[PDB]
Amino acid sequence: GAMNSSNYAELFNNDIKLFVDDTNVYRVTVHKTFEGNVATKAINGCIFTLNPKTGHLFLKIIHTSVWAGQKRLSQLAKWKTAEEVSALVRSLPKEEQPKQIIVTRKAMLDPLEVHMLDFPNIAIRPTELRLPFSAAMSIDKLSDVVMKATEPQMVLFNIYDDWLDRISSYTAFSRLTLLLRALKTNEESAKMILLSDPTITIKSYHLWPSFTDEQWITIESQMRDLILTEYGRKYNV
């Protein structure tokens, strides 16, 4: 059925699974026209397809050309997402194919189920988790490859850098969701926390800074403080 707090460890078992988040597939700026109407301008988007056990991120860049002369783009974006996830599964060797695909938004269930009819043994599931994957585009290297794209492109990342050398996938996922939730809640404050200290850098081959274990504890506490601080600011609490 649906993935929730009851079945959290299931994310880190040895059954291959992918999260799919479609919140950055169709991205627009809204502006006034010369006649004072309103128009949208699409910008490049992405599908966020993540293996939470291994950190492998299949970032499918959605170039604005795919919207050209199309109607009902918010509807089409879900079907394009499902088409591309289906194409990714078919591209993978059998032993690498997921046994489950967890969609972050319930509106992705029918499109993905219909595109995956040829895979009746791959379960398509919603989640009751509120996951902050919309903030993927706050990770500078991911934003940069999406915006620079001139055509449809798939780029492969490990969203955990080398953390799994030191920590479990449960802990790595917890750290990722904390970082993304902080970036979602107050992007400028989170990037200051991560990038403030110039003596700690990001390796060419990494997304996040090269924190030692003790520095990660400090950063994680600063991220929790940020989220609390912002919840207090929001609710005047």
Partner 1 sequence: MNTVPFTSAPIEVTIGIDQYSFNVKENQPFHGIKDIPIGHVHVIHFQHADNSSMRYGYWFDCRMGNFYIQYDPKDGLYKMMEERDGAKFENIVHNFKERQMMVSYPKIDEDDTWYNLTEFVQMDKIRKIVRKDENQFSYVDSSMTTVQENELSDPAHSLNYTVINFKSREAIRPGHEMEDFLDKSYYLNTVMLQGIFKNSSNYFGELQFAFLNAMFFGNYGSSLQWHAMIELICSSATVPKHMLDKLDEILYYQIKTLPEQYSDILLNERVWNICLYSSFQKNSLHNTEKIMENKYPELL
Closer CB to partner 1, 32 or 71, in the complex? 71
The reply on whether position 82 binds partner 1 by CB under 8 A is yes
Closer CB to partner 1, 76 or 145, in the complex? 76
The reply on whether position 15 binds partner 1 by CB under 8 A is no
Selected from 28, 43, 73, 76, the binder of partner 1 by CB under 8 A is 76
* Minimum gap (Å) between residue 17 Cβ and partner 1: 21
The span from the CA of 84 to the CA of 101, in Å, is 13
Contacts with partner 1, 114-133, as mask; x by CB under 8 A: xx-xx---------------
Selected from 12, 79, 170, 216, the binder of partner 1 by CB under 8 A is 79
- Half-sphere exposure of residue 25: CA atoms within 13 angstroms, side-chain side: 26
The helix-helix angle for 169-185 and 213-235 (nearest 10°) equals 40
Selected from 10, 54, 113, 222, the binder of partner 1 by CB under 8 A is 113
The reply on whether position 53 binds partner 1 by CB under 8 A is no
Helix (H, G, I), strand (E, B) or coil at 78: helix
Backbone angles phi, psi at 131, to 5 degrees: -100, 140
Cβ neighbourhood burial of 198 (10 Å; 0-12, 13-18, 19+): exposed
Helix (H, G, I), strand (E, B) or coil at 142: helix
Backbone angles phi, psi at 37, to 5 degrees: -80, -175
Closer CB to partner 1, 113 or 230, in the complex? 113
Window contacting partner 1 (CB under 8 A); options: 52-60, 75-83, 180-188, 190-198: 75-83
Window contacting partner 1 (CB under 8 A); options: 44-52, 110-118, 182-190, 203-211: 110-118
The secondary element (H helix, E strand) that includes residue 87 is: helix 73-91
Window contacting partner 1 (CB under 8 A); options: 28-36, 56-64, 76-84, 211-219: 76-84
The span from the CA of 236 to the CA of 188, in Å, is 20
* Minimum gap (Å) between residue 194 Cβ and partner 1: 39
The span from the CA of 103 to the CA of 22, in Å, is 8
Window contacting partner 1 (CB under 8 A); options: 112-120, 155-163, 164-172, 190-198: 112-120
The reply on whether position 83 binds partner 1 by CB under 8 A is yes
Q: How far is CA 160 from the centre of its chain?
A: 12
Residues β-bridged to residue 102:
19, 125
Yes or no: say if 179 and 172 are a contact pair by the CB < 8 Å rule: no
Which chain residues interact with partner 1 by CB under 8 A? Answer: 75-76, 79, 82-83, 110-111, 113-115, 117-118
